[PDB]
Amino acid sequence: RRARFVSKKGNCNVAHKNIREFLQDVFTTLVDLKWPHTLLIFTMSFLCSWLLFAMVWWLIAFAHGDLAPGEGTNVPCVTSIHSFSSAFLFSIEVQVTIGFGGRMVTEECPLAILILIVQNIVGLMINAIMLGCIFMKTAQAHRRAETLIFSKHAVITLRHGRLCFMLRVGDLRKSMIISATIHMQVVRKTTSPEGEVVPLHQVDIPMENGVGGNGIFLVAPLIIYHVIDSNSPLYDLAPSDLHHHQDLEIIVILEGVVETTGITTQARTSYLADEILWGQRFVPIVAEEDGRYSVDYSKFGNTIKVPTPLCTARQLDEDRSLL
Amino acid sequence: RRARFVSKKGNCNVAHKNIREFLQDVFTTLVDLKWPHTLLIFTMSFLCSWLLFAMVWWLIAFAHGDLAPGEGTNVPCVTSIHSFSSAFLFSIEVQVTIGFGGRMVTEECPLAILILIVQNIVGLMINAIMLGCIFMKTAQAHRRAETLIFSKHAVITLRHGRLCFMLRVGDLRKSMIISATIHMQVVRKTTSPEGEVVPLHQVDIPMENGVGGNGIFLVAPLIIYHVIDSNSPLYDLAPSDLHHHQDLEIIVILEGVVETTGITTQARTSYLADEILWGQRFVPIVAEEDGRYSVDYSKFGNTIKVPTPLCTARQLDEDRSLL
Amino acid sequence: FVDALNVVPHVFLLFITFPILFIGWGSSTWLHFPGHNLRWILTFILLFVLVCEIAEGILSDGVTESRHLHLYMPAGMAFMAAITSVVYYHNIETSNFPKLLIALLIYWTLAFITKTIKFVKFYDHAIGFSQLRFCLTGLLVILYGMLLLVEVNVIRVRRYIFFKTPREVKPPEDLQDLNLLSKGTYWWMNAFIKTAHKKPIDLRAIGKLPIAMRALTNYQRLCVAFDAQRAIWRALCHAFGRRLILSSTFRILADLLGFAGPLCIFGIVDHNAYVLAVLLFLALLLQRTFLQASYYVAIETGINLRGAIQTKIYNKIMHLSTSNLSMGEMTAGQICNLVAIDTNQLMWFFFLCPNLWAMPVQIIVGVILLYYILGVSALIGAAVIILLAPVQYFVATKLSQAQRSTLEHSNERLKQTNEMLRGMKLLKLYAWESIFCSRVEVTRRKEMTSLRAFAVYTSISIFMNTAIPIAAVLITFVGHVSFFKESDLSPSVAFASLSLFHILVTPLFLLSSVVRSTVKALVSVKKLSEFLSSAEIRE
Amino acid sequence: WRACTKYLSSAGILLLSLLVFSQLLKHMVLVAIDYWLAKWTDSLDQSVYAMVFTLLCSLGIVLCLVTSVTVEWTGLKVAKRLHRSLLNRIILAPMRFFETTPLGSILNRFSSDCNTIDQHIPSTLECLSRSTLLCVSALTVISYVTPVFLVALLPLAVVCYFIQKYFRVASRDLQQLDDTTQLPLLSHFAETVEGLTTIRAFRYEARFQQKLLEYTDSNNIASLFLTAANRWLEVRMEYIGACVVLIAAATSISNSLHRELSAGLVGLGLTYALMVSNYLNWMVRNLADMEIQLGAVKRIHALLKTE
């Protein structure tokens, strides 16, 4: 409860209080919303326009003298029209292009041919904008699958005599995720020797591959693997300092585009200090089995205890100094 | 049959057994499927909704007293309606906007004007979502052409006195492929000196261009060209060790976007150890001919024997040590 | 107003309507959601209801003029619908994620209740003919709706109270081997039997039994409940008694309707034909399945029982005093045969033990249930059918001494064979290769005698079996011809007596084996407690 | 299939053929006239029903003796033939295999296939007998019960035989697994007996008892799969049984009384139909158990072929 930056499942929880301004725009926002407001909002829209043209033909029909029923000395402006419902149903007939055909309009009433054409045009407009945007909706939504996943908790070790800090990623679908990189940040309280304090100053830790490099290749699960070295800004912290008091939630960003969509998307998590723990290690996840490779995620984060040096990485930089 | 990671044509064959969960979502999946399930699934959908509103107008018509045929003392809720088929055909008339016009509705039966408007709205919804998604289908599918291709088998040599490991890519269409990079990984059994074993630990081999660099420019076929050096993690293996027992399938990833689509896509292959072979070399593929350049892929992988040092690249790092 | 009857169809047909789209569009962690098996059984009986309705329809349609009536279909649509209803329950719960699908199911279950109400205004006439099955479906469908309510009453699917989904994890399945209704008919072994033949099976293909099947926890509870309490039977059957009785009562529901064949034979034996036919079909299905799954309950309980029995065996054996090796080899061979022999004895007896409980309840109901109380052609032939009891059990009375006899002979033949066969180059250089027949045929002589005669006493018994049924019916049947009710011969009583003769014939021979099982079981208790009293080592 | 050609060659076996068949017809006809003469009375005739009673009685007694005496005669015969012949021709021989095949090549048959030949084999051949008796018996009985029961047969019966077909590999599989899991238990118990001072003395009890629980589990899953598969067999083939009683017995409703007016068919047809479905079960278990018996003799064929 102490400090929260992003969540275990990884949503950014930090909010914003009263910037100097709502983000003036029209259809950017509807698509980002949830279903009920988009569906409801449109059917309400149709009901709006429908109502409108309903009543306009109600009136123009009415005041044209043909609406009050009679016999002879007249031609209808719309056939067999009578009262509220009549006009309503006929306008709604034209919008989505029904056309029972029982009701009918003639060329007699010029303002009527007017009002008809204007209705059809603007109605086709609302049709267009609607279908186009909801298209853009099923592109991506709040349901955009974060198929990439990440551990309940994380550890460190010394690989090749050198301290290292893990994480696990993961895939909730069998389908292909491609062009996948990694960028990962650290948040901590920070102050200048010249005395200018900032809330948090994001500083990089490179994910150590070969040839530097931003990213790794995910279909099979593969561990993420990197440096703690006294040149790298994360070298200082102590094992028994961080696990209790020292404030860390390490944030990690992966950015990719799910193979079939052709649109970018991402997924997120951090790690609370008390969560990130010392000197344990990941079990082998995958195994070669049957006639294939075999993968069991039931063990995804399972952990072992390893005889690895318990010391402060500042005193393994003092070990890196001494031995 | 021993070890399989991705295929000769390059599909990833490795599967996943029982992750902790199907990837809860709605329309992400349909598009990734194949044709029969999408086409069939929609026409079945239309049949669903159609059936529904069919029967609803069946009933409301029925219990309204006008469905049982009579003469006088009535107005129809829908004209000339009689039995199952009648209502069926008329509802289906309204959905996709037919409107024979022979059958007709009046304003008499308020619940009828209700049921009509609600039908038209939701029906236009299914129309929308459908057309939009299948749009997204012909964007890309499982038929997405892997036009990039790659050799039946691969070799090595010493270029400029330095060992090197090839591959060939390729293009099955005359059209343009642009913004094309390369990322390539190696899978092998790996263990720490500190004794933590992983199933496979992906490690990089950079494709050696000029100025490092991730990618090369494909219209004309161009060989891929790189390092084996004792600093590079692939330096150790022996010629006569790998070709039989030593486990390698070198995986190679290319990620691009076919010029006209504006969406990313990729293609994949690996190479089985016994497949990757020693001391052969690629024939010249292209030739200058007629009034143009000329390219024959019938030779695409054709191969020659070259007098190049037979030794272990660890003993050509011991040669790199000695001479 | 028949708009009611047809007005029932709308809700259900819609319930299929949305569902077919969802499941079709859907085109591996198994689990168990809320109360499940209850809803499974309620579903099954429900299907029985709906199919019965087609009988009332099939009655009403024929009498009516101008072909089939509109009302006859509505039932049909329903019985089609609920079927799939269970299925969406299957692709939902088994897929977990019970957010929307559960909701929708709640919707369908609700919109039923209105149709039930339509029966409630149809209530003006109380005969029941269609009414009984109908309002019967009122109570049924309603109680089901309460079941879905319970589904809210465990996991709490809906948006209420923002409790999300408490207590969510899978049962302990990782290696495992390699639902109720499908499970009962053994649908789960299809992969095992196909991939079985894919390549002949290996110990790698089979893998550890689950926890609840694991011998450890087996001996665990056995040992605590036992320690919570000489003569152990009280303790053992008071340990596994739950699964024991559970097997029992289900076995008696399977057995009691074992009579299903006979009564149906009487009914169609009358000439309401088709209805009786189909009802008989569903009958046979229920009966057969139930009986087999009964066998499952039995043997299964067996696997657990014997398995832990071993745990007690060595568990006490080692922790006991070693000075009893003063008994030594006798405990070696004999006390070995306690586990090896006496175990299989024990678990066999437990396995058939519910058949022991219920076996008479089936029998006496067997004789008594025979139509034909008034004429004395019943208790006579059927009194032969009971008279075959001492035939079998006495066939044992001559069987045992035969078996242990071939046992004594086999010791000699086997011992002499093992003795002459080893160094045969040494007996060849000694140049005999002759009196081996005196070592064999003379050994075979008794071994040809005690064996041969035994087989005779063995085979004759089985012969009497094939003699009893054919003679029992016929003579009994023929007896009626001469004796009483001479006026009319009816086909009903005839083929009826055939079927009841077959089914009733089974349990008699079964018991004739069962007695030996109870006896050997007792002796097993004796030597078992004998192992209990053995010398304990001080720790 | 070699042992029928080989083992069952131990006698005049066709002499056992017809007599057993003299049983089958005896039963079938016994019903048929009880299916007619009785039901035809239902449609001095009581004495005709007594005639049918007579032919049924003496037919059941003749079948009765011929069956059993035929069985024990067959078994004893093949026994005295086989043990004598094999053992004898084996005894006199060079030393190659006498020194090649460490005593597990001889002790097996006499232990297993001899006493288990008397035990298992004789009651087995009888099980195949009464078995196929029920098989063809239902085939022709119901075949009469319908003017066409092949409409009821072709896919039903065929695919039945397919099910049992892939099921035999299960038989050999599972039962093979049981025969496997039996040995290590008696290996262990006796072991702790021998080291009764050893293990207690040496403070190793834990690793051992754990080794117990191991063999327990493997054993008992082996069994659980065994009975599992069995009761699978019964459940299914019985179920398709309910299919044949449904289809056949129902289809009676029309052509019989509605068309032919026949009342002399359903009266038998129902009975033989259902009891036939249940018996089909016994048929499958019989064929399997017959194979499991044939295993031993086909394994004795080796020393049969010996020099």
Which chains does chain C touch, 3 or more C-beta pairs < 8 A? B, D
Task: Report the Cα D146 to chain-centroid distance in Å.
Answer: 29
Local structure of residue A214 (DSSP, 8 states): S
| Token pair belonging to B81 | 């309606």
Local structure of residue A172 (DSSP, 8 states): S
Q: How far apart are CA D75 and CA C503, in angstroms?
A: 31
Residues with Cβ within 8 Å of C233's Cβ and at least 6 positions away in sequence, in order, are C525
Local structure of residue D254 (DSSP, 8 states): I
Q: What angle do CA D51, D55, D59 make, to 5 degrees?
A: 165
Judge whether B302 is annotated as a binding position.
no
> What are all long-range contacts of B26-31, with beta carbons under 8 Å and residues at least 24 apart?
B26/A138, B26/A143, B27/A138, B27/B129, B27/B133, B28/A143, B28/A145, B28/A258, B28/A261, B30/B133, B30/C25, B31/A260, B31/B133, B31/B134, B31/B136, B31/B137
Strand segments, DSSP code E, in C395-525 are: none
SS3 state at B38: helix
The one-letter code for the residue type at C339 is V
Q: How far apart are CA D255 and CA D149, in angstroms?
A: 12
For residue B44, the number of C-alpha atoms closer than 13 Å in the C-beta half-sphere is: 17
Judge whether B225 is annotated as a binding position.
no
Q: Which of A3, A10, A16, A15 is nearest to A252 (CA)?
A: A10
Asked if residue A153 lies in contact with residue A276, where contact means CB atoms within 8 angstroms, the answer is: yes
Residues with Cβ within 8 Å of C107's Cβ and at least 6 positions away in sequence, in order, are C15
Which method was used?
Answer: cryo-EM
Residues of C in Cβ contact (< 8 Å) with D193: 331-332, 336
Asked if residue A187 lies in contact with residue A276, where contact means CB atoms within 8 angstroms, the answer is: no
Asked if residue A180 lies in contact with residue A215, where contact means CB atoms within 8 angstroms, the answer is: yes
The one-letter code for the residue type at C489 is L
Instruction: Please classify residue B104 by burial: count the beta carbons closer than 10 Å to its beta carbon, then call 0-12 exposed, 13-18 middle and 19+ buried.
Output: middle
The torsion angle over the Cα atoms of residues C522, C523, C527 and C529, rounded to 10 degrees, is 20
Asked if residue C421 lies in contact with residue D103, where contact means CB atoms within 8 angstroms, the answer is: yes
Residue found under tokens 């603007």: A122
Residue found under tokens 């669903």: B48
Asked if residue C273 lies in contact with residue D253, where contact means CB atoms within 8 angstroms, the answer is: yes
Give the Å distances, CA to CA, from B248 to B154, B243, B251, B252. Answer: 13, 9, 9, 12
| Phi-psi sector, D195: left (phi>0), alpha (psi -120 to 50), beta | alpha
Task: Name the strand (E) or helix (H) holding B293.
Answer: strand B292-294
Residues of B in Cβ contact (< 8 Å) with A262: 139-140, 257, 261-265
Across the interface, whether the CB atoms of D91 and C436 are under 8 A apart is answered: yes
Asked if residue D39 lies in contact with residue C490, where contact means CB atoms within 8 angstroms, the answer is: no
Across the interface, whether the CB atoms of B194 and A130 are under 8 A apart is answered: no
Across the interface, whether the CB atoms of C325 and D196 are under 8 A apart is answered: yes
Distance from B36 to chain C by nearest Cα, in Å?
Answer: 11
Residues of A in Cβ contact (< 8 Å) with B128: 130-131, 134-135
Asked if residue C466 lies in contact with residue D60, where contact means CB atoms within 8 angstroms, the answer is: yes
How far from each other are the two terminal CA atoms of chain B, in whole angstroms?
40
In chain D, which residues are followed by a C-to-N distance beyond 2.5 Å, i.e. a gap?
43
Asked if residue A187 lies in contact with residue A251, where contact means CB atoms within 8 angstroms, the answer is: yes
SS3 state at D39: helix
Instruction: Say which of C197, C264, C489 has its CB closest to residue D169.
Output: C197
Nearest CA in chain B to C101: B24
Task: Report the Cα D226 to chain-centroid distance in Å.
Answer: 17
Asked if residue A1 lies in contact with residue A272, where contact means CB atoms within 8 angstroms, the answer is: no
Kindly write down the DSSP assignment for every residue of D93-156, as one continuous string: --SSHHHHSTTTTTHHHIIIIIHHHHHHHHHHHHHHHHHHHHHHHHHHHHHHHSS--HHHHHHH
Local structure of residue D274 (DSSP, 8 states): H
Distance from D302 to chain C by nearest Cα, in Å?
Answer: 18
Q: How far apart are CA C284 and CA C278, in angstroms?
A: 10
Residue ranges of the alpha helices (H) in chain B? 27-32, 35-61, 84-95, 110-139, 239-242, 319-322
Asked if residue D300 lies in contact with residue D80, where contact means CB atoms within 8 angstroms, the answer is: no
Q: How far apart are CA D146 and CA B157, in angstroms?
A: 81
| Token pair belonging to C141 | 């469908």
For residue A35, the number of C-alpha atoms closer than 13 Å in the C-beta half-sphere is: 6
Residues with Cβ within 8 Å of C269's Cβ and at least 6 positions away in sequence, in order, are C491, C492, C495, C496, D266, D267, D270
- Mutation target to probe the D interface, by most D beta carbons within 10 A, among C470, C480, C531 is C470
SS3 state at B215: strand
Instruction: Please classify residue B307 by burial: count the beta carbons closer than 10 Å to its beta carbon, then call 0-12 exposed, 13-18 middle and 19+ buried.
Output: exposed
SS3 state at A204: strand
Local structure of residue A109 (DSSP, 8 states): -
Asked if residue C258 lies in contact with residue C207, where contact means CB atoms within 8 angstroms, the answer is: no
Cβ neighbour number for residue A118 with a 10 Å cutoff: 12
Pairing of strands B292-294, B203-204: unpaired
| Token pair belonging to C106 | 């709640």
- Length of chain D counted residue by residue: 307
Residues 32-61 of B with CB under 8 A from C: 33, 37, 41, 44-45, 48-49, 51-52, 55-56, 59
Across the interface, whether the CB atoms of B55 and C18 are under 8 A apart is answered: no
Q: Which of D138, D172, D169, D134 is nearest to D156 (CA)?
A: D138
Q: How far apart are CA D111 and CA A265, in angstroms?
A: 73
Task: Report the Cα A100 to chain-centroid distance in Å.
Answer: 44
Q: Which of B54, B51, B86, B60 is nearest to C7 (CA)?
A: B60
Query: Helices C273-319 & C344-368, crossing angle to 10 degrees?
Result: 150
Task: Name the strand (E) or helix (H) holding D3.
Answer: helix D2-5
Asked if residue D90 lies in contact with residue D305, where contact means CB atoms within 8 angstroms, the answer is: no
For residue C139, which phi and psi values (nearest 5 degrees)? -60, -45
Nearest CA in chain B to C169: B20
Strand segments, DSSP code E, in A166-311 are: 177-186, 190-191, 197-198, 203-204, 249-258, 264-272, 280-282, 287-289, 292-294, 303-305
Q: How far apart are CA B68 and CA B81, in angstroms?
A: 9
Residue found under tokens 């005295």: D80
The one-letter code for the residue type at A222 is L
Give the Å distances, CA to CA, from C434 to C355, C437, D88. Answer: 55, 6, 10
Asked if residue B28 lies in contact with residue A262, where contact means CB atoms within 8 angstroms, the answer is: no
Residues with Cβ within 8 Å of A48's Cβ and at least 6 positions away in sequence, in order, are none
B16 vs C: CB within 8 A: no
Asked if residue D122 lies in contact with residue D74, where contact means CB atoms within 8 angstroms, the answer is: yes
Instruction: Please classify residue B36 by burial: count the beta carbons closer than 10 Å to its beta carbon, then call 0-12 exposed, 13-18 middle and 19+ buried.
Output: exposed
In chain C, which residues are followed by a C-to-N distance beyond 2.5 Å, i.e. a gap?
27, 178, 229, 271
Q: Which of B112, B116, B51 is nearest to B84 (CA)?
A: B51
How many helices (H) does chain A have, and how many strands (E)? 6, 12
Residue ranges of the alpha helices (H) in D12-114? 14-33, 39-42, 45-91, 97-100, 107-109
- Mutation target to probe the B interface, by most B beta carbons within 10 A, among C6, C11, C21, C25 is C25
SS3 state at A5: coil
- Length of chain A counted residue by residue: 323
For residue A275, which phi and psi values (nearest 5 degrees)? -75, -55
Local structure of residue B105 (DSSP, 8 states): B
Instruction: Please classify residue C85 by burial: count the beta carbons closer than 10 Å to its beta carbon, then call 0-12 exposed, 13-18 middle and 19+ buried.
Output: buried
The one-letter code for the residue type at A139 is A
Q: How far apart are CA C245 and CA C251, in angstroms?
A: 9
Pairing of strands B264-272, B280-282: unpaired
For residue A147, which phi and psi values (nearest 5 degrees)? -85, -40
- Length of chain B counted residue by residue: 323
Q: Using the Cα atoms of residue A231, residue A234, residue A237 and residue A240 in order, give the sign of their dihedral.
A: negative
Diameter of chain C by CA atoms?
A: 108
Instruction: Say which of D72, D91, D192 has its CB closest to residue C317.
Output: D192
Give buried/exposed letters for C198-221 (b at 16+ CB in 10 A, else e). eeebeeebbeebeeebbbeebbee
SS3 state at A292: strand
Q: What angle do CA A166, A168, A174 make, to 5 degrees?
A: 160
- Length of chain C counted residue by residue: 539
Across the interface, whether the CB atoms of C17 and B33 are under 8 A apart is answered: no
Local structure of residue B50 (DSSP, 8 states): H
Asked if residue B275 lies in contact with residue B155, where contact means CB atoms within 8 angstroms, the answer is: no
Give buried/exposed letters for A280-303 (b at 16+ CB in 10 A, else e). bbbeebbeeeeeebebbbbebbeb
Residues with Cβ within 8 Å of C383's Cβ and at least 6 positions away in sequence, in order, are C367
